[PDB]
């Protein structure tokens, strides 16, 4: 029966208004009743191996210049896969295993433009992402036993979550990649790059989790290029943060990311891209 007047802060993406003077509601309340993650569990992608039952086998293609399909010349057999961690992200595959010799591309149909072009790396391009705001986690009890973990006031300055990638290293790796595009699109052609066409946050931005929060990072900065070939600096990146996620077609759930108390910094390798192409 008794009620309170508690206060909390929310990110712009989570709320949406209805028009008193002004108001708001959570963007999930019209789609699905959500569940908060227990702040006890972790989301860390740990190396998981996939092993076969008895009387079964898994075949490992130990071929450097392997484009994924067809007869792999030298094959080995193994019971379990090497440690593959569930790093889930969009437009950027993170922390995986690089290619051995040359950046080799993989695609089902290079001719059919509607098929995504999975690109594997040979050097792990370094990415450092943070959110500088020192934050508050005020435990608002909405009883009984149920305990909402709200955000409280802000401690310190205000400046969004960003990502840093060395310009030079990326300006070199992009050349290394376009070098392998020309083996598909003619010995001498021009390969431009642009940002996403249009769609939801999960598609047009760098959806990923790091330390407990879900970044959606603009990808327009990196894709600035045009390829004509026959000191210290970084390319800073501007990310929005979300808590109420709807990940997956609509089958993850809607889940409230429990706010993290402190400064969240993570360093990651980028090991591949999920490209697309539009005579």
């Amino acid at each position, epitope marked *: 029966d008794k009620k309170q007047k508690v206060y909390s802060l929310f990110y712009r993406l989570d709320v949406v208004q209805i028009n008193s003077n002004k108001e708001y509601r959570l963007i999930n309340c019209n789609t699905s009743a959500c569940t908060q993650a227990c702040p006890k569990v972790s989301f860390e992608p740990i190396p998981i191996h996939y092993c076969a039952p008895a009387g079964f086998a898994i075949l490992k293609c130990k071929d450097k210049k392997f484009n994924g399909t067809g007869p792999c010349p030298s094959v080995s057999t193994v019971q379990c896969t090497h440690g593959i961690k569930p790093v889930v992200s969009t437009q950027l595959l993170l922390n995986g295993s690089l290619a051995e010799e040359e950046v080799m591309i993989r695609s089902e149909n290079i001719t059919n433009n509607a098929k995504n072009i999975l690109v594997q790396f040979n050097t792990p391009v370094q990415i450092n992402c943070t959110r500088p705001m020192n934050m508050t986690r005020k435990s608002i009890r909405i009883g009984p036993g149920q305990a909402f973990y709200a955000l409280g006031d802000i401690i*310190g*300055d205000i400046r969004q979550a960003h990502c840093n990638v060395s310009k030079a290293t990326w300006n070199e790796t992009l050349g290394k990649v376009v070098k392998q595009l020309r083996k598909h699109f003619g010995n001498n052609t021009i390969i431009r790059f642009a940002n996403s066409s249009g769609g939801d946050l999960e598609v047009t931005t760098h959806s990923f989790n790091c330390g407990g929060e879900f970044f959606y990072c603009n990808t327009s900065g990196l894709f600035n290029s045009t390829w004509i070939s026959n000191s210290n600096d970084s390319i*800073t990146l501007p990310c929005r943060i979300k808590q109420i996620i709807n990940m997956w077609q609509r089958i993850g759930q809607c889940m409230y990311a429990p706010p993290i108390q402190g400064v969240i910094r993570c360093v990651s390798n980028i090991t591949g891209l999920i490209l697309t192409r539009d005579s």
Partner: antibody
Amino acid sequence: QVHLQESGPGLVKPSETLSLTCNVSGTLVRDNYWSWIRQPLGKQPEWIGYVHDSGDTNYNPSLKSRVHLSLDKSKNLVSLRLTGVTAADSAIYYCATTKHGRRIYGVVAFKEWFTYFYMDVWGKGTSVTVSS
Amino acid sequence: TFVSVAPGQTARITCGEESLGSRSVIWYQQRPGQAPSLIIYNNNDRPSGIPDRFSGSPGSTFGTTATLTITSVEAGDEADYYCHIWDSRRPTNWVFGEGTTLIVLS
């Protein structure tokens, strides 16, 4: 060297145009940014506003509607106009050279930074009283 | 407000509301009957003519207040002290920080 010399009526009736001037020396009016600061008797100084050639000039929000600034390059003087004076406006009006600065708490990328000001060299001031 | 310090000791002076962001606070020493003289900017960067006695709080701290540290107080330092606060979180202040009178004793 450097020197400042305010001047003006030293008294104006209510609801009139107080006009004050600041004689400049030791440099040009085009070079430095200027600022004015009135100080009521026994109270804390209320900063008026800052003026520079090329239109870099902003005013106090508490008195934004009533104030006016200018610089006479030929005469080499810091002008000042204020309209509708009242009892709350009687004070010692100083004249101060002002210097800009940049405080950067971030990556600078944003626009995440702020211009803080500091008036290093002052003037003696002029006692502007207000009574009928 | 008045601060009474024994001679040759260290005085401290408190100015303004609590910090909200990383700040840049100016410190002014107005002597009785004279004009304010600029003492410290950048929260600890003193210009020409000011000894390294006077100190302050670096504007990197949040939640704490603006502090002025007068080391080895001398008779001349008897004055009123103001300060201009530049918080990254609060709008530009045009009302200078309220005074604090230093009183060397005996």
